[PDB]
Each structure stands twice: as structure tokens, then as C-alpha cells.
Amino acid sequence: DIIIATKNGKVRGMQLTVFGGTVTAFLGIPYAQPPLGRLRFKKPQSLTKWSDIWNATKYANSCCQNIDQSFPGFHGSEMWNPNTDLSEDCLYLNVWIPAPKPKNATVLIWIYGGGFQTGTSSLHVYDGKFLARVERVIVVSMNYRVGALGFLALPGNPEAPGNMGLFDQQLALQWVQKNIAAFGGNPKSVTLFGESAGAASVSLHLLSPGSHSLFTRAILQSGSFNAPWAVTSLYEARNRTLNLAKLTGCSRENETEIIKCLRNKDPQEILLNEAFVVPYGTPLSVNFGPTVDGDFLTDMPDILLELGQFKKTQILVGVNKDEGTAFLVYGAPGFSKDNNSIITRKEFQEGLKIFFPGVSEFGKESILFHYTDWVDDQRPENYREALGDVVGDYNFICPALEFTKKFSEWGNNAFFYYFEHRSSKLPWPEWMGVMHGYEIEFVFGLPLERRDQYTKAEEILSRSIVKRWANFAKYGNPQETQNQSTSWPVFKSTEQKYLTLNTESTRIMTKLRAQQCRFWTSFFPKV
Ligand SMILES: *[C@@H]1O[C@H](CO[C@H]2O[C@@H](C)[C@@H](O)[C@@H](O)[C@@H]2O)[C@@H](O[C@@H]2O[C@H](CO)[C@@H](O)[C@H](O)[C@H]2NC(C)=O)[C@H](O)[C@H]1NC(C)=O
Ligand SMILES: *[C@@H]1O[C@H](CO[C@H]2O[C@@H](C)[C@@H](O)[C@@H](O)[C@@H]2O)[C@@H](O[C@@H]2O[C@H](CO)[C@@H](O)[C@H](O)[C@H]2NC(C)=O)[C@H](O)[C@H]1NC(C)=O
Ligand SMILES: *[C@@H]1O[C@H](CO[C@H]2O[C@@H](C)[C@@H](O)[C@@H](O)[C@@H]2O)[C@@H](O)[C@H](O)[C@H]1NC(C)=O
Ligand SMILES: *[C@@H]1O[C@H](CO)[C@@H](O)[C@H](O)[C@H]1NC(C)=O
Ligand SMILES: *[C@@H]1O[C@H](CO)[C@@H](O)[C@H](O)[C@H]1NC(C)=O
Ligand SMILES: *[C@@H]1O[C@H](CO)[C@@H](O)[C@H](O)[C@H]1NC(C)=O
Ligand SMILES: [Cl-]
Ligand SMILES: [Cl-]
Ligand code: NA
């Protein structure tokens, strides 16, 4: 029986057997007042405090969110859907600690992705019990508000200031600072890690003055705030907020009246209108996201990054070989998870209209010119392959490389990886390759469970990743020092060395996607 005394009360956890050892789990500890009623759309309020023992013995509710219904019955998509009841009462976190209680362990805090519109900490691929068991770190993860309920913005108005879901994250980080020594953790050794929107979040915590002293280091998996989907301008934000008002019959003249109205709508009415606050969207739409609010974010973040105004510390950044393939079966003509999706020059053109709503015609011709100089066979899968690369390079890979260059130009060590292993258990078709999201299970150590039908080469790959991530968090250096592994060099502007992660041998390469990113990074933002 394990009871830990926290500043807000006592909590009881539960013991789990993992690989012939024990980890203790505290699932669903609250970290804020439930944001209901008049608290809807507001910054999270700190926690009142209970007496008696809070039982943290199951995962809490997930925050309200629309769900992916494109492939009912399909594990590939359904594995990302929420697996606890949805509810506005969702502000909870989880802690996993090694047994016996460690003495001053390093802390890993996970922030989930989901486009800022979806996600939850209780997914199976985010289970922190392997990391605690194997590397004797503490793992924490939190639920934060997503969609309008987490990011609705009427700039300058504390009834709806914007960025509320980012303040949920921040307050969870504060909870770790005040409470983690009680569970055996070292608050002076805290690493944030995250994927996609969760990576983008990690990168804004690097820019946010209020987050500066709540963590030590940061890991960014497939995402950063300079991605084109990650930050909403103040103009779009207001247009979207009134557009949602209009659609829910909440249009008013006094802005506090709109918010007051919207606080009487009920969750399903808000969720149901989120998709249309925008004339045209794409499979990568972030209708309600981070904004420059003058509080969490004090200036456009491209300016902060260029001019060196962020937390000085080490970073670990990466991307997957086929980032862009997942999104093509959500609306590109000729694509299906149920066939090899050979498409034609003209389907490719239509595909760009889907992914670049506009985007002048010259904008779109220039993408085509740059990605369709075949060399050459012909090669029926030429156009199918080119559309995934377009989507991956633009949305994930070039933005992560550019964040990494600029961050490192200010004097800090940075490490970059390119993950190129396709899970032997991937339920999506072969043509989709090393998809977005499918490194996560390796980072969390799921392939360490033999019972689970991964190959031997995959167990070893996972074991090596887990060690590198842990060494990064503990010591600031992602090396695996014992099994004569390849050294991971720091990434600098100039040489730009990166490390490949795959089940054969890993290599040091230079200048990932050099020609492609010159296009996205120098030219395209002009059109
Ligand atoms: C700001 O919003 C307007 C409003 O248009 C929207 O009305 C909302 C309530 C919502 O239902 C949404 O689906 C609808 O489009 C946008 O204006 C629209 O823009 C398109 C393309 O230019 C026009 O064809 C429409 O006529 C026009 N609608 C109206 C009613 O004027 C506008 O684009 C948007 N501006 C942005 C992007 O900030
Ligand atoms: C690969 O499949 C796509 C997807 O559309 C189809 O999915 C199949 C598995 C099957 O159930 C089919 O009936 C379903 O519509 C095909 O794209 C479609 O191609 C058909 C040609 O009949 C068009 O009529 C559809 O408009 C088009 N749909 C979309 C949304 O793209 C595609 O042709 C097929 N390609 C192959 C076999 O290479
Ligand atoms: C636990 O260690 C504390 C300091 O260790 C951290 O100090 C940071 C500045 C940074 O170097 C981290 O990477 C270090 O790991 C120490 O001050 C505490 O007193 C220790 N607490 C214990 C053991 O009770
Ligand atoms: C907390 O959990 C334990 C389960 O054994 C129980 O004994 C205790 O009464 C619980 N309190 C509740 C259910 O609120
Ligand atoms: C709008 O209504 C709010 C809410 O009662 C009120 O406090 C505010 O003064 C009004 N704003 C103006 C200046 O019209
Ligand atoms: C090192 O290699 C051995 C096999 O010789 C393996 O079992 C062990 O887990 C490896 N350690 C890491 C951190 O990869
Ligand atoms: Cl043509
Ligand atoms: Cl190696
Ligand atoms: Na050009």
C-alpha cells in the first residue's frame, strides 16, 4: 500500500509488475480546479486541496474532442482515439515511479500530439511504466484542453484570452516543481518530451518566460512551433471566434456577451461547429491553436527564435522518414489505405489543391516543378511518392531542421535524428512507409515486452533509443556508451550532422533534405 503526501493532499497509487520488477503508478491526480461553468475558456485555476486519500488508481476523463470516424473498426486510426470518457472535467496527470522509490530521480514529462484539437495521456503508446522500470526515471504526463475549449481567442480579454491549453501544461509543470520530490523525483532535472502538436508545445515552452524555470531540457519529436500549422495569427483567431459565435447563434456586439453566451452552449454544440469556423480546411487544419497572446507568448515566435530570445539549454530534435503519407488518405483523390494508391499527374495536381487551399496557382505550379523532375525510370509510383514528400517536407521536416539550425546558432548543443524503421506490426499499408507517429512506441519501450510480437531486431532498437533518451534527460548527451554504438555528434549550422535510427547500423549523415528545404524555407514563404 503506497500513500504519498502532496501539498494538496494524500494520494494512493497501485503496484504493477513489469519485467519481473515493480513500478508504482499514480493515474489521474488532479492538478487544477475543473474548468467548468464560469471557468470555461479561462486560464486554469490552482488546486484547492482535499483531505482523506485521493485514489489515483485509474486514468481520468479525457478532454472534450471530436473523434476520428474515417475507418471504424481499423486499429491504425482507432488506436489514436480517446480511451476514457470525455468531459470538461479533464485536468489530471499521471506519475510512474520505480520501486523501490528512487532517491532523486530524473523526470520525463510527456506532452501528447493531436493537432491541438485531440489527444489524451492514457493511450497505450504513452504508457510510462516501461521507462520507469528500465531506466529508473520518473515519467509524468498530463491532460490539457484542446479545440475551442482550449484555444478559443478574443485577444486581450481574460474571459477568453487564448492559449489556455498551453497554460494547463504550464500549471502541470508547476505541480511537478512543487510536488515531485515527495515521489522521489529531482525537480532540478526535468525533461519535457512530445510528438507533433506536443513537440510544438515543448518548443513554445522554450520561448515562454513563465515556463523558463519549470524544466531543464527538451525533446522534440516531429514538430516545432515554426511548422506552418502551429500558430494562429491574431486576425484568423478573431475571425474564427466570431465565426463560431455566428454558427452557434451567439453573435453579440459586446464581446464579453459572446463569451457569456458560448459558456451556455453545451460541449457537443461547440465541437460540432469547430470544423466550419474556416472556409476551406485540409487534413492538417488546426482550427483553434496557439496565438500570440501577450502572456504565454510575448511576440511573434519567428522573431524570438531569430533574435535569440529563448531558454538556453540542450535540445534533441527528430523526424520520421515518411511523415506526410498518413494525411493523404484523408482527402487526396486516388489515395486509399486499401490499395497501392498509384495516382496520375492530374490527381497529384488535385492533391495540391487539397493541401494548399490557396496559395496562388503560381504557388502550386512551383511545388510541382520542384517535386516532379523525375530521374527517372517512370516509375508508376512517382507521383504517389512525390505527394507524401511534399506534405512531409513542408509540414514537419524542413520546419524541424530550421528550428534546429537557428536554436543551435546561439551556442547550445543540439542533436538531430532521422527515424527510418517501419514497425513489423504496422496496420497501415506498405506504401505508407515509416509513418508519422510510429516512433513513439519505440521511445516508450513497448517492443521490450517480448510477449508482444515485435521482432528481436526491434527489441534491440527500442532498448537503444530508450537509453539514448534517458541519457539525454539525465546528462544532456544522447549516447549509448556501452555497446560500442555510433556516437551521436552535435548538430551545428554549417555541417548539419544527424543520426539515423534503424535496426541495422545507424549512420552519421549531413544536410538532410538540403535541396527540398531550400525550396520551402527560402522561396515558398514568398508566394
Ligand atoms: C472570415 O470568415 C468569413 C465568414 O465566412 C464564413 O461564415 C462562417 C460563419 C462559417 O460558416 C464559414 O464556413 C463561412 O465561410 C469568411 O468569408 C467567406 O470567404 C469565402 C472565400 O472568400 C467566400 O466565398 C464567402 O462568401 C465568405 N463568407 C461570407 C459569409 O462572407 C472569410 O474568408 C474569413 N476570413 C478569414 C480566413 O479570416
Ligand atoms: C484505390 O482506391 C481508391 C479509393 O476509392 C475506392 O477504394 C477502393 C478500395 C474501393 O472500395 C472503391 O470502390 C472505392 O471507391 C480509388 O479511388 C477512387 O477511384 C474510383 C475509380 O472507380 C473513383 O470512381 C473514385 O472517385 C476514387 N475515389 C477517391 C476518393 O479517390 C483508386 O482508383 C484505387 N486505385 C487503384 C486500384 O490503384
Ligand atoms: C538532488 O540533486 C540536486 C541537484 O542535481 C541537479 O542540479 C541541477 C542544477 C542540474 O545539475 C541537474 O542536472 C542535477 O542533477 C541537489 O541539489 C538536491 O539537493 C538533491 N536532492 C536529494 C538527493 O535529496
Ligand atoms: C480508495 O481506495 C481503496 C481501495 O482498496 C479503498 O479501500 C478506499 O475506501 C477508497 N476510497 C474511495 C473509494 O473513495
Ligand atoms: C460589455 O459587457 C460587460 C459584461 O457585463 C461589461 O462589464 C462591459 O463594461 C461592457 N463593455 C462595454 C464597454 O460595452
Ligand atoms: C547492450 O547490449 C546487450 C547485449 O550484448 C543488451 O542485452 C543490453 O541491453 C544493451 N544495452 C543497451 C543500453 O542497449
Ligand atoms: Cl500539365
Ligand atoms: Cl550502433
Ligand atoms: Na520559383
CATH number at residue 54: 3.40.50.1820
Active-site residue, 196 included: yes
Domain of 522 in residue numbering reads as 1-527
Burial of 74 per CB tally in 10 Å (0-12, 13-18, 19+):
middle
- Report how far ligand 8's centroid is from the alpha carbon of 500 (Å): 10
> Which chain residues have CB less than 5 Å from ligand 8, an ion?
485-486, 506
Kindly identify the ligand whose nearest atom is closest to the C-alpha of 54.
4
Q: What is the phi/psi pair of residue 306, to 5°? A: -55, -35
CA gap 183, 168 in Å, rounded: 21
The residues pairing with 6 across neighbouring beta strands, listed in sequence order, are 9
Ligand 1 center to residue 347 CA distance, Å?
27
Is 436 a residue of the active site? Answer: yes
3-state DSSP call for residue 382?
A: helix
Q: How many helical (H) and strand (E) elements, i.e. helices and strands, does the chain have?
A: 16, 14
195 is catalytic: no
Q: In sequence order, which residues have a C-beta less than 8 Å from that of residue 324 and are 6 or more positions away?
A: 387, 388, 389, 390, 391, 392, 393, 394, 395, 396, 436
Q: How far apart are CA 120 and CA 113, in angstroms?
A: 8
Distance 331 CA to ligand 7 centre (A): 22
Ligand 5 site: residues with CB under 6 angstroms? 254, 256-257
Rounded distance between C-alpha atoms, residue 173 and residue 109, angstroms:
8
273 sits in which H/E element: helix 267-274
Cα gap 170→190, rounded to integer Å: 13
Which of 205, 370, 421, 436 is catalytic? The answer is: 436
Angle (CA) 25 464 508, round 5°: 140
DSSP three-state, residue 403: helix
Q: Which method was used?
A: X-ray
Three-state DSSP class for residue 232: strand
What's this structure's resolution in Å? 2.1
Binding-site entries for substrate = 114-115
From 159, 195, 274, 323, active-site residue:
323
Give dist(CA 118, CA 337) in Å, integer.
22
Element (H, E) at 246: helix 234-247
Count of beta carbons in the 10 Å neighbourhood of residue 316: 26
Q: Do 492 and 412 form a contact (C-beta atoms < 8 A)?
A: no
3-state secondary structure of 380: coil
**Cα separation of the two ends of the chain:** 62
**Nearest Cα residue to atom 13 of ligand 5:** 254
Query: In the chain, how many domains are there?
Result: 1
Query: How far is residue 19's CA from residue 99's CA, in Å, rounded to a whole number?
Result: 12
23 DSSP β-pair partners = 16, 98
Strand partners, 92: 30
Q: Is the CB of 247 under 6 A from ligand 1?
A: yes
